[PDB]
Structures are given as C-alpha cells and as structure tokens.
Amino acid sequence: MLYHLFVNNQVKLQNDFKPESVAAIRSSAFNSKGGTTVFNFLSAGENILLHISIRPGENVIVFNSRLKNGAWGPEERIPYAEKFRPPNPSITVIDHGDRFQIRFDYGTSIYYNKRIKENAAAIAYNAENSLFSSPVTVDVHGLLPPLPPA
Amino acid sequence: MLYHLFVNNQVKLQNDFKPESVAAIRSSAFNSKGGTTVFNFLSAGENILLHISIRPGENVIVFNSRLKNGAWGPEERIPYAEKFRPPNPSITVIDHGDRFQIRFDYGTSIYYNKRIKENAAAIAYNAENSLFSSPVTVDVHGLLPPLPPA
Amino acid sequence: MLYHLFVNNQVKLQNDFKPESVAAIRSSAFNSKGGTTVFNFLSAGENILLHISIRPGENVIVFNSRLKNGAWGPEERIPYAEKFRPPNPSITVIDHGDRFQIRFDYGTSIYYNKRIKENAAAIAYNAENSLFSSPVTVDVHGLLPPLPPA
Amino acid sequence: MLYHLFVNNQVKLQNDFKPESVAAIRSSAFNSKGGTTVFNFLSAGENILLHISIRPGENVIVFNSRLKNGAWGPEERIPYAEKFRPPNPSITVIDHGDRFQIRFDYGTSIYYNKRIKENAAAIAYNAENSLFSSPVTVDVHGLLPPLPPA
Ligand SMILES: OC[C@H]1O[C@@H](O[C@H]2[C@H](O)[C@@H](O)[C@H](O)O[C@@H]2CO)[C@H](O)[C@@H](O)[C@H]1O
Ligand SMILES: OC[C@H]1O[C@@H](O[C@H]2[C@H](O)[C@@H](O)[C@H](O)O[C@@H]2CO)[C@H](O)[C@@H](O)[C@H]1O
Ligand SMILES: OC[C@H]1O[C@@H](O[C@H]2[C@H](O)[C@@H](O)[C@H](O)O[C@@H]2CO)[C@H](O)[C@@H](O)[C@H]1O
Ligand SMILES: OC[C@H]1O[C@@H](O[C@H]2[C@H](O)[C@@H](O)[C@H](O)O[C@@H]2CO)[C@H](O)[C@@H](O)[C@H]1O
C-alpha cells in the first residue's frame, strides 16, 4: 500500500501496522542543511509507540515512546553521521512483534523493544526545516515481500 | 531515482530517459470522478516525445507526439475501461530504442513507435481534476532492475 | 550472491553471514513424501550455529545449535503443518545480531536467539529423501535489498 | 515459477511462455575458459523459436530459429565481449508479442523478431564446457512483476 506522507501531517493506515508489517519510507531529496526531523508511529488512541528524532545539529538520532498525554521515557540514541544516503535517503521500519527494527541507508539496524503494546494506526511526519522531502513515499507491507537477487 | 511529480507541474530528470530506461509511476489514490489526466515525456527542447492522455469520460487513453511549437500527429488510442486498479493505480513506461512500451495495472502492454528521435529530459503531469494523487511517486531506472521471484 | 546448494553437500560463502545478512532459500519442487530435511548454518570452525531440522513424519521443525564436537542443546520446535507452499517452497533466514529470524511460506516468523557467538562461513543441506529440490536456489545478501511495492 | 535448468537438458514450462512472459536466467558461476554455450526456447512441437549461441572464442553471440527438422535461417549477431558479469552472470528474455527482448548483464538489449509464431513450451541448455553453472536458476513470470526502487 502506497502513501504520500507530507511534512507536519500524517497518513492513516488502511490496516494496522502490526507484527510482520514493513514500512518503507523514501525521500526524493536530501536537504543537508535541514534541521531536526521527526517520524512518529501512532496508535488509534494517539499514543506514540515509536518516536524517531533525527537531529543533525546534535549528531544523534533519538528513539522514544510516550502515551498521548504522558511523559517521555528513557531515550535510546545513536550517531547521526553517515546513516542517510543522498539524494534518496530512506528509513525502513519492521515490526518484529516484541520490538521494532529500524534500518537507515548505512550502518547496522537499530532495535527498539516495544513499550506500549498496541498496533500503529497512523504515521506522522514533523519538522520545521525538514531533512527530507514533502511528501515522503511510504510503502507499507503486511509482510516481507519476495526479494530480488540484488 | 525517486521523484515526486506534482500535478500541473513536472520534474527535471537527473539523467536522460533513453533506451533501456524504465519509469515506474504510482499513485497513492484513485479518484473515480476524475477528469482528463495527462502525462508527458518532454525532451530538452520541450518536444512532447510521448503524450499519454487518459480520458475517463471519452473512455479512451490517447497516445501522441508533437514538437514544442508544432501540431499533433495521428492518435493511437485504446479503451480506458479496466486499465487501472485502485487504490494505487500505476503506469509504467519503458524505452526500447525504436518504440515505447506502456503498461497499466490490467491488460497487455501497449507499444508506441517513436516519432521524435530525442531522449526525454523531463516528465510532466497535467489535469484539471486529476484521476490520481498529487504528487505521484515516480521511480526512474537506467536499466531494468533485479526482479523478485514474484 | 547466488549459490546452488546441492543436497547432502554445502556451499562455502563468499563473505561471512553476519548481522544484517539475509539468506533466501528457494526450491523448484516439493516432494510431499519427503523425509527429514536439514539445513545448517556452519561457522569457519564447523560449529553448527543454526540447525533447522524439518520433520514431516514427526510433524515439527526443530531448531538447535551445537559445537563441532559437542552435544546438542535444548530444542526449540514448531509445528510443521502448513509452513510450506508448493511447488516452490521457501525458507528465509535473517541475522539480527542477537538472534536469527526464520520465515517460511506460511505463518509468522520464528526467532531463535544465538547460542554460539560466531558468524557463518558455510550453509549445509542434508536429507535422505529430501523434501525439496537438489540443488536449492540460494540468494545471500549483505543487507536487506530494495523492496518492490508488492 | 522457479526452475533449475541443468546443462545438456531442459525444463518443461508449467505454462506457455507467451507475450508478456519474462524468463530470468541466472548462473551461480562464470567459467571464463568455457566454450560455446547454448540456450533454446522450444515449442511444444520442438521447433526452436529462439536460439541463443554464446560463442566466447569467436567473440560473438548468435541468434537464430529453425523448425524441428528445418534449416537455420539468417543469423543475427552481436559482440560477446563485456556482456556478462561474473560471478553471477545472467540472461533475461522477455516476449513482447511481435519479438523477443534479450538483456544480458551489460550493454543494451537485443531485439529478435519472432519467426515461428508459437509459444514456448520448454527451455533447453546445451554446452560441452559450459560458460555458466549447472543448473542455472530460471524464474519465469507470467508478466513483469512490481519493481523495487533499485
Ligand atoms: O525523548 C524524545 C524527546 O526528546 C526531547 O528532547 C529532550 C532531549 O533529548 C534531552 O536531552 C533533554 O534533556 O530534554 C529534552 C526534552 O525532554 C525532544 O524535545 C522531543 O521532541 C522528543 O524527541
Ligand atoms: O491527440 C492528442 C491531443 O488531442 C487533443 O484532442 C483532440 C481529440 O482527441 C481529437 O478527437 C480531435 O479530433 O482533435 C482534438 C484536438 O486536436 C487534446 O486536446 C490535446 O491535449 C492532446 O491530447
Ligand atoms: O535437536 C537437534 C538434533 O535432534 C536429534 O534428534 C533428537 C530428537 O529430536 C529428540 O526428541 C531426542 O530426545 O533426541 C534426539 C537425539 O538427540 C537429531 O537426530 C539430530 O540430527 C538433530 O536434529
Ligand atoms: O545459426 C545458428 C547455428 O549456427 C551454426 O554455426 C554456423 C556458423 O555461425 C556459420 O558462420 C557457418 O557458416 O555455418 C555454421 C553452421 O550453420 C551452429 O553450428 C549452430 O549450433 C547454431 O548456432
């Protein structure tokens, strides 16, 4: 299923993003001078199941969760440098049931254990001076598709 | 290469669309009540190498070519009914040197012999009440990529 | 990388099967009357990092690990029924650093935590009356490849 | 549909290779010192609809056709050099209805007009000292599948 997720907006998923589900986020540009760019996986109740904060100017990507009206939990971080590949940087999120797998263009995957057991109903995109394009292409799968030889 | 082609606009390609090149056009929605939607493959000199005019009312897809300041030549048209598949309708164009191959969601491929011997420098998208999303996700290849077993 | 893994034989990998690596195993046939078929991911020192024992009669798929000259540890098994899809049954293994993820044609993914902290140097295939073809087509990736929209 | 086409043998297609059909041939090796290697697309009547003769020692690839007990027609040739890419060279054949498209690893595609109007029922592989592996992996499609971004 294809979606065009615009900045400072979101897309309501046709089906719940649940275990086995794959979200392929791809940008049609890379604005090297952009600022903090955020991507949230929200539940039907608007809880933030997976928060990804891409901070170029702090050289770190922060992962967290929080309930609609709750506080943030502990931050899980990683170096921002050499993760994205211009001109079409991408982010791939896979629900492995007990945790999420987030793969960027470079480096090994980041594993985030689930903190709020609920499936995702929507994907949000927030940033004032986005690091990526608007919209970004999002192809959500019900499961891993057949893979090409390369 | 990923491009986001907004309606009544166009996208300047990073490299010429030439023989062996494949353009994968995908929309995140299908507006049944949509009007006439047009996709053009333009050359550097703005010649319309391949004109794809989708007409729901008139029930046909019309293919043509035309120089920037010239007149349209004969039309090669086909039935519009049962070509697209909602919610993510698609259009794929492949350059085979002497002719273009066009493929939709349903039916067989359509072949259109080249009339203006030039490569494409940009892809246009026009519509008053587009049949598709805005923008449309467009993936351009230099050659046919590795195929999945399914 | 494409390998043809013949039965009761193995294939020496061009590069270590490590975290982020994906192995796409596919058979060109399914022999219903097949017996116990085994696939092993072996380390340079011939340790059996991941043992996949498919048992049609006993109706289960058994996962285990073992040092070259050591004894098997506890078995992590699952029901065999409705896992494969003829005529081209498949098995996919992905290394996630701390555990392996196994996927068949049907059902959800299976996760097996690593027991022997070593990378795989070869992939073995054993069977008296194999359930699959000989050889089996095997595509190994360094990282997850680009995914088709479907 | 997957097939394992062994040298000096063939594979009977589950379905007729006809217009829109794609055959993806991939070798798991490249024997640079190998000799002439042949791949034939045969009809149910054993007519050779598409003959591909890969001649390294003559630096040419020859295309031809002929009926089960008929003579060869005129040869359509091309340079052999820099077409295949080790260690996993490939050949892709696509039926465009009025002609075939043959793409190797490098160079533009070769277009062969059909000479015997019949669909293919089998694919043969002949060579004394093959340039490729045995078997070769063959994934035949009923039509072009969804393409990955790269
Ligand atoms: O935890 C995610 C959350 O972080 C906020 O920023 C934190 C910052 O990381 C921390 O070092 C500082 O002490 O407190 C800030 C506020 O909690 C972001 O503002 C917010 O957008 C999320 O990304
Ligand atoms: O042929 C492409 C061109 O068609 C124009 O419409 C045609 C119409 O299809 C034809 O039946 C009539 O005879 O002439 C019209 C004008 O030449 C479209 O208006 C134009 O945008 C192109 O799509
Ligand atoms: O556990 C992997 C190992 O199993 C052996 O068979 C086991 C059998 O599954 C178990 O029920 C019994 O208690 O012990 C047997 C031998 O330890 C297989 O023979 C061996 O090949 C591996 O597959
Ligand atoms: O035409 C395909 C056919 O060619 C045969 O070889 C030809 C050769 O190409 C030509 O130059 C010579 O004059 O005659 C030979 C016999 O026709 C191959 O022997 C045969 O296998 C096919 O590849």
Distance D132 CA to ligand 1 centre (A): 57
Close Cβ partners of B135 (under 8 Å, ≥ 6 residues apart): A4, A135, B4, B5, B6, B7, B9, B125
- CA distance linking residue B91 with residue B93, whole number of Å: 7
Answer whether B6 contacts ligand 2 (Cβ < 6 A). Answer: no
B146 and C145 within 8 Å at the Cβ level: the answer is yes
Tell me the CA–centroid distance for residue D50 and ligand 4, in Å. Answer: 14
CA distance D90 to D105: 6
Q: Following DSSP, what letter does each residue of A48-97 receive, concatenated?
A: EEEEEEEEGGGTEEEEEEE-TTS-----EEEE-SS---SSS-EEEEEE-S
Please, which residues 81-120 of chain D have a Cβ atom closer than 8 Å to chain B? 92, 96-97, 101, 103, 108-109, 111
- Give the Å distances, CA to CA, from A28 to A25, A47, A54, B135, C123: 10, 29, 17, 11, 39
Please tell me if residue D130 touches chain C, with a CB cutoff of 8 Å: no
Q: Give the residue among A110, A116, A78 at the shortest CA–CA distance from A92.
A: A110
Please name which of A1, A18, A3, A33 lies closest in space to residue A124, comparing C-alpha atoms: A3
Backbone angles phi, psi at C116, to 5 degrees: -110, 105
Q: B61 CA to middle of ligand 3, Å?
A: 63
Tell how strand A22-26 and strand A136-141 pair up.
Answer: antiparallel
Chain B residue with CA closest to D1: the answer is: B149
What determination technique applies here?
Answer: X-ray
Q: Measured between CB atoms, which of D19, D20, D108 is closest to B20?
A: D108
* Rounded distance from Cα B77 to ligand 2 centre (Å): 11
Left if phi > 0, otherwise alpha if psi is -120 to 50, otherwise beta: which for D45?
alpha
Closest Cα in chain D, distance from residue A88 (Å):
10
- Cβ distance B1 to A88 under 8 Å? yes
State CA A57 to chain mean position distance: 19
Torsion over CA of C148, B40, B88 and B14, rounded to 10 degrees?
Answer: 30
Assess whether the previous peptide bond of C135 is cis (omega < 30° from 0): yes
What whole-number distance in Å separates Cα of residue B148 and Cα of residue A145? 9
Taking CB atoms and an 8 Å cutoff, what residues of chain D touch B109? 20, 96-97
Q: List the one residue out of A140, A98, A136, A131 whose CA is nearest residue A117.
A: A98
Structural Rg of chain C based on CA atoms:
14
Q: How far apart are CA B95 and CA B93, in angstroms?
A: 7
CB half-sphere exposure, B45, CA atoms < 13 A: 11
Contacts 24+ apart (CB under 8 A), C56-60: C56/C80, C56/C131
The two three-digit tokens of residue C60, written as one number: 């289960």
Radius of gyration of chain A (CA): 14
Whether B26 sits inside 8 A of C145 (CB atoms) is no
Q: Tokens standing for C78? A: 């699952």
Q: Which residue of C has its CA nearest to D86?
A: C1
Between CA A60 and CA A38 the distance in angstroms is 12
Instruction: For tokens 């709020």, name the residue.
Output: A116
The Cβ-side half-sphere exposure at C49, using a 13 Å CA radius, reads 25
Q: Kindly state the DSSP code that residue B116 receives in the 8-state scheme.
A: S
Any chains having at least 3 CB pairs less than 8 A from chain D are A, B, C
What distance in Å separates the CA atoms of residue A134 and residue B1, rounded to the nearest whole number? 16
Compute the distance between CA of residue D55 and CA of residue A80 in angstroms, rounded to an integer: 51
Q: Atom 10 (ligand 1): residue with closest C-alpha?
A: A75
- H or E segment and range at residue B9: strand B9-17
Short-list D96, D100, D104, CA closest to D143: D96
Q: How far is CA D136 from CA C135, D126, D133, in A?
A: 10, 12, 6
| CATH numeric code, B1-150 | 2.60.120.200
Taking the C-alpha atoms of residue C1 and residue D65, their distance in angstroms, rounded to an integer, is 33
What's the rounded Cα separation, in Å, for the pair C130 and C33?
9
Q: For residue A119, give the DSSP letter.
A: -
Q: Name residue A41's beta-bridge partners.
A: A50, A123
Q: Which amino acid is at A150?
A: A
Instruction: Report CA torsion sign: C149, D22, D98, D12.
Output: negative
Tokens 């798991």 correspond to D28
Write the CB contacts of C144 (distance below 8 Å, at least 6 apart in sequence): A92, A103, A147, C20, C22, C94
Question: Which of helix, strand or coil describes residue A113?
Answer: strand
Burial (0-12, 13-18, 19+ Cβ within 10 Å), D100: buried
Q: How far is B50 from chain A (nearest CA, A)?
A: 24
A108 token code pair: 């090994």
Shortest CA gap A98–chain D (Å): 28
In D10-122, where does DSSP find H-type helix?
none
